[PDB]
């Protein structure tokens, strides 16, 4: 996260870390939508272009973390994957359309003061929260800078970072990339004349873009950290997977009934 802040403890109890076994490394962010399901970005598991193709056994899921590198014995929970589901129409070749994916935990996780699920939006909620100008909140353990002087510092944060960005008008998003954006995406970030900055960055992908409902006091996951052109560049914005439209697929995958 660029130009963010340290999150307070228990600020995003739904924040999940995607850990790689060997080499041990941070793959991506992800969210807890329930007792056994994790929502992440597809490009975190599969991106041929870089020979990226993880399987259920190559990863671990760590829930309830604050510190990036520590092994928080008393607070975090380390889960193994039972099955991974990628959106059948995930387009990693041209625009990363439908960059969404679910992961099924092997055993349900026990909720706590540090581990709690986020809500998924309903039609009306999406309808009234997803409006340009309204602010969202991104969280992660990714790069603090798009680039930096090697060995002179640390590109990564010690604890979970947080940043609040506004939603940008489609037309504005469209005119910022040569890429073909779809109705399955949305962009966020401050504008050049806005006097503020902030963006997600490498490592933050799969992370959740959430919004707070003033009427019910609950947090809703409107998007997933998807892609972007560098980090915190002027006249550029971050692209997020539109969680509301891909909902039927989620519905269909989860099968709660």
């Amino acid at each position: 996260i660029v130009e963010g802040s340290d999150a307070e403890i228990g600020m995003s109890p739904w924040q999940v870390m995607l850990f790689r076994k060997s080499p041990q490394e941070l793959l991506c962010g992800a969210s807890l939508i329930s007792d056994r399901w994790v929502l992440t970005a597809a490009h975190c598991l599969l991106y041929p272009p870089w020979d990226k193709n993880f399987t259920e056994n190559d990863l671990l899921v760590r829930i309830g973390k604050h510190s990036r590198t520590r092994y928080e014995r008393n607070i975090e929970k380390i889960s193994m994957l039972e099955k991974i589901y990628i959106h059948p129409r995930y387009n990693w070749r041209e625009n990363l359309d439908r960059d969404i994916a679910l992961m099924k935990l092997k055993k349900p996780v026990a909720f706590s003061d540090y581990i709690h699920p986020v809500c998924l939006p309903d039609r009306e909620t999406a309808a009234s929260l997803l409006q340009a100008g309204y602010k969202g909140r991104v969280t992660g353990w990714g790069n603090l800078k798009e680039t930096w002087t090697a060995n002179v510092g640390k590109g990564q944060p010690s604890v979970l970072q947080v940043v609040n960005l506004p939603i940008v008008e489609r037309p504005v998003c469209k005119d910022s990339t040569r890429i073909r954006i779809t109705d399955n995406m949305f962009c966020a970030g401050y504008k050049p004349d806005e006097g503020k900055r902030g963006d997600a960055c490498e490592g933050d992908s799969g992370g959740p873009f959430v919004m707070k409902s003033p009427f019910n006091n609950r947090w809703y996951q409107m998007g997933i950290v998807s892609w972007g052109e560098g980090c915190d560049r002027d006249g550029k914005y971050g692209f997020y997977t539109h969680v509301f439209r891909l909902k039927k697929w989620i519905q269909k995958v989860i099968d709660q009934f």
Partner: peptide, 29 residues
């Protein structure tokens, strides 16, 4: 049905986080 969206150390304790209001005010502009 299942509860979600309510942070155990925040919403549930009637406390708010440091930059939560920036989100809220962004609605009433």
């Amino acid at each position: 049905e299942a509860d979600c969206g309510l942070r155990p150390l925040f919403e549930k304790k009637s406390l708010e986080d440091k930059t939560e209001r920036e989100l809220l005010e962004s609605y009433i502009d």
